[PDB]
Design a protein around this ligand. Structure first.
Ligand SMILES: *OP(=O)(O)OC[C@H]1O[C@@H](n2cnc3c(N)ncnc32)[C@H](O)[C@@H]1O
Lengths: 51, 23, 51, 81, 598, 26, 24
């Protein structure tokens, strides 16, 4: 999100691509999962499309 | 939405050229 | 960095190839777009927030 | 039926966990319910309430609380064959 | 060079502050503060063993505990609104999302999310799921970041301050960030008095702080508890708390003066200042100790007053301290203007001349020295005129003359009174038309809007916007209103709650794009508007009427205060606009235009 | 030994209110 | 606390005065 903000031009599409092979990045700790979910939701409201 | 190019949003993914395919 | 089968490109190599292909496609089609590459899970860090 | 109730209770426990993680607190405190565990609940039931439940006695409980299910099972059996 | 603050995590200080705040009795707060101070002192003793001139002290944490007393750091320039905007920008929260609206509209209780008046609590609730549980920033790092932020605000660098705030957010917990927000706003709401904190820190910490007006010097000098300072008095280039005056009894003056002749002088409407002259060096300090030397100048080569008042000083005056008032002298009218025009300094006290201290001297000697220290020049530097009086009749005559001259009251001083910094009444008293009952003309007007309160008065209406009515045609009621001013004080908590309940159901949200027809606003738009047919008549004891461009009527009330929410009078008995104009023209501003007869 | 070692962690008058229902059954 | 008077809290509920009650 900070990198997206650093841009100074007008962006018609803000997109993020996640290349990973782990389906449970945060299983040991539940707080990390909640924080990640909150951040993903905030990015979604901001207008960032994640794949 | 469906068929939209993943590289250039807003443009449909152009089908690869097939040349000539006799029936 | 582990491949289930032999003689098969690892997930990291596949991601690198896909990123390179997307870069080439963007250069040829629309060179005015903005692309960024960020790696997470490594040891060294380079961020504006020092994460 | 017990299995269905157990899975529904697990779903409700997951909902409660999500609510707690959302960052909210109950208006009261008596309503707090500890997490449901199938093994612990079954063990406690067997240790405590099994002697009373298993007491058929003269058959009155069987005809008082186990007749609709009995009729439905018999109807299913006769329909099958 | 090792500092204790670098070894003290901010989490410990935050936990101590939270423990103090949650406590209801002052004993627990004192115990917690004493334990923390003892731990800090033990760490200090253990750290430095064979090092001389140890400059370390409790100042790094002392400043954080009492941000309001910070003087070394410049103004932050960020408050609740700006801090909320910065938090929204940094966290990348949606602009129109629930969290952003709650942070921006922290005063509005419509969200019914915990506290509705405390911005810190709302910020903590919003940041609970966004920040880690354990921080890693020490007190020294936090202080360095705060100083960097202050310099950035003074250096006109928004990017750097934004980066510092982002680092603070990313390297702190929810409680730590809440405490940082409270410190930035300079309102901790600890519940323990400043004097109690100073007494806990040291026996005579308060007196030294008042004399010097600097936490760093107090922390450094008064480090050991047993080793105190033998003497403490006003020192050169050290701001000291000015001596104020308490409310003056109108029929006990003699009893207040101990039956001796007293000085009476017209009260001046300006800015209280203290000037220190050391040869060619000038230091100007404000009432709260803030450094004003930049505006007035440090040397005769620069400034607005010193370059012109230097010539007025005598040759045999190398060290001097003066305390006086700054006003705007217009030479076209050759008169002072209340709060072409030039700065004018009216001096009334001298606490130090040459190498002697006048603090403990009698007022007569101080006045003589003030008269024999420099030659006044009208318009730039002058001496207040004091008149001797020993009967109540003279005081009444002086008050009458002040009212007739469109002044702002009089001041009475005892000849034997001594200068004691931070004393609200020890021989100095002020007599104004406001205090006397019946002299002022009460202003009864309607209520047309309200605002949500902040702090203790969170979920209720704390202040209201009032409007006068126009002149309707004969046989018709008034349906048009013009806003006059805003009233926030004068109503007790019980009366305020009763008024809010009486109009709680009748409140209507205000929309800027669609202002109400009945109520017409100027530059200030109430958050909630109430139609005039159902409203109460509030009485205000306004001090004076001044020209205001923020209201439709064009005038506002100085020092407004509610006196009573009258119930006998209905909503249609409020003042008319023509009546307001007549009152304004009755005495050309000040409402006090009646004499005192007894 | 670091900061961890040096830092750790009848009267009155009774009042009564009578609440009486005014329902038809009463 | 058991036996607390409902009229005056903090004081034991004084039992009614019986007088002389001859036994069997
Ligand atoms: O209302 P208040 O307590 O702020 O008023 C007292 C302040 O006003 C200053 N003042 C104003 N006029 C004078 C004269 N003539 N002499 C001394 N002080 C004066 C006080 O110093 C105080 O700051």
């Amino acid at each position: 999100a900070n990198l997206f903000s650093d841009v100074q031009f007008k962006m018609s599409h803000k997109r993020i691509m996640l290349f990973t092979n782990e389906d449970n990045p945060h299983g040991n700790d539940s707080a990390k999962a909640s924080r990640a979910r909150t951040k993903a939701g905030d990015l979604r409201d901001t207008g960032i499309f994640l794949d | 939405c469906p068929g939209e190019s993943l590289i250039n949003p807003g443009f449909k993914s152009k089908k690869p050229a097939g040349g000539v395919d006799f029936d | 960095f582990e491949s289930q089968s032999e003689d098969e490109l690892t997930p990291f190599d596949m991601s690198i190839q896909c990123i390179q292909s997307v870069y080439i496609s963007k250069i040829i089609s629309s060179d005015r777009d903005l692309l960024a590459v960020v790696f997470y899970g490594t040891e060294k860090d380079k961020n504006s927030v020092n994460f | 039926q017990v299995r269905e109730l157990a899975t529904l209770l697990h779903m409700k426990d997951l909902e409660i966990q999500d609510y707690q993680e959302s960052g909210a607190t109950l208006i009261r405190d008596r309503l707090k319910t500890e997490p449901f565990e199938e093994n612990s609940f079954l063990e406690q039931f067997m240790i405590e309430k099994l002697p009373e439940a298993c007491s058929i006695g003269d058959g009155k409980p069987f005809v008082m609380n186990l007749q609709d299910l009995y009729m439905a099972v018999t109807t299913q059996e006769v329909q099958v064959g | 060079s090792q500092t204790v603050a670098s070894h003290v995590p901010f989490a410990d200080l935050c936990s101590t502050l939270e423990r103090i705040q949650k406590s209801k009795g002052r004993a627990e707060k004192i115990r917690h503060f004493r334990e923390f101070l003892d731990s800090w002192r033990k760490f200090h003793d253990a750290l430095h063993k064979n090092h001389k001139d140890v400059t370390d002290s409790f100042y790094p944490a002392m400043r954080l505990i009492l941000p309001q007393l910070e003087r070394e750091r410049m103004a932050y320039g960020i408050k609740e609104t700006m801090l909320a905007k910065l938090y929204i920008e940094l966290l990348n929260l949606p602009r129109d999302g629930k969290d952003a609206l709650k942070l921006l509209n922290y005063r509005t209780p419509t969200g019914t999310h915990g506290d509705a008046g405390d911005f810190a609590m709302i910020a903590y609730f919003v940041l609970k799921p966004r920040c880690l549980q354990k921080g890693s920033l020490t007190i020294q790092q936090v202080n360095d970041l705060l100083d960097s932020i202050a310099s950035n605000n003074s250096a006109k660098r928004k990017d750097l301050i934004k980066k510092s705030l982002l680092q603070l957010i990313t390297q702190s917990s929810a409680l730590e960030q809440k405490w940082l927000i409270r410190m930035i706003i300079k309102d901790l709401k600890l519940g323990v008095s400043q004097q109690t904190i100073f007494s806990v820190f040291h026996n005579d910490a308060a007196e030294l702080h008042n004399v010097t007006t600097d936490l760093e010097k107090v922390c450094r000098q008064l480090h050991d508890p047993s080793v105190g300072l033998s003497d403490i008095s006003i020192t050169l280039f050290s701001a000291f708390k000015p001596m104020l005056a308490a409310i003056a009894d109108i029929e006990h003056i003699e009893k207040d003066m101990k039956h001796q002749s007293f000085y009476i002088e017209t009260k001046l409407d300006g800015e209280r200042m203290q000037m220190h002259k050391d040869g060619d060096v000038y230091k100007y300090f404000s009432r709260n100790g803030y450094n004003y030397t930049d505006q007035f100048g440090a040397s005769p080569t620069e400034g607005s007053l010193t370059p012109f008042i230097h010539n007025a000083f005598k040759a045999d005056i190398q060290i001097c301290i003066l305390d006086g008032e700054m006003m705007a002298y217009n030479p076209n009218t050759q008169t002072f203007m209340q709060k072409d025009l030039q700065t004018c300094y009216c001096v009334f006290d001298v606490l130090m001349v040459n190498n002697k201290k006048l603090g403990h001297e009698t007022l007569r000697k101080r006045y003589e020295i003030l008269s024999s220290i420099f030659t006044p020049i009208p318009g730039r530097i002058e001496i207040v005129q004091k008149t001797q009086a020993h009967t109540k009749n003279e005081v009444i005559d002086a008050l009458n003359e002040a009212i007739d001259k469109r002044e702002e009251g009089i001041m009475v001083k005892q000849p034997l009174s001594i200068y004691k910094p931070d004393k609200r009444g020890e021989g100095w008293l002020k007599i104004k038309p406001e205090y006397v009952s019946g002299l002022m003309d009460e202003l009864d007007i309607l209520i047309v809007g309200g605002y949500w309160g902040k702090g203790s008065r969170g979920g209720m209406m704390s202040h209201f916007l009032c409007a006068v009515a126009e002149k309707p045609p004969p046989g018709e009621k008034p349906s048009v209103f013009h806003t006059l001013s805003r009233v926030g004080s004068g109503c007790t908590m019980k009366e305020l709650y009763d008024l809010g309940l009486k109009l709680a159901k009748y409140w209507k949200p205000f929309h800027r794009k669609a202002p109400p027809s009945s109520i017409l606003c100027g530059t200030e738009k109430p958050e909630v508007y109430i139609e005039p047919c159902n409203s109460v008549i509030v009485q205000i004891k306004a001090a004076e009427i001044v020209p205001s461009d923020m209201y439709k009527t064009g005038c506002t009330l100085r020092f407004p205060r509610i006196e009573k929410i009258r119930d006998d009078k209905e909503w249609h008995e409020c003042m008319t606009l023509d009546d307001l104009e007549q009152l304004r023209g009755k005495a050309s501003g000040k409402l006090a235009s009646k004499h005192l007869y007894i | 030994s670091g900061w961890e070692s040096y830092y750790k962690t009848y009267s009155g008058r009774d009042s009564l209110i009578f609440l009486v229902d005014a329902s038809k059954a009463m």
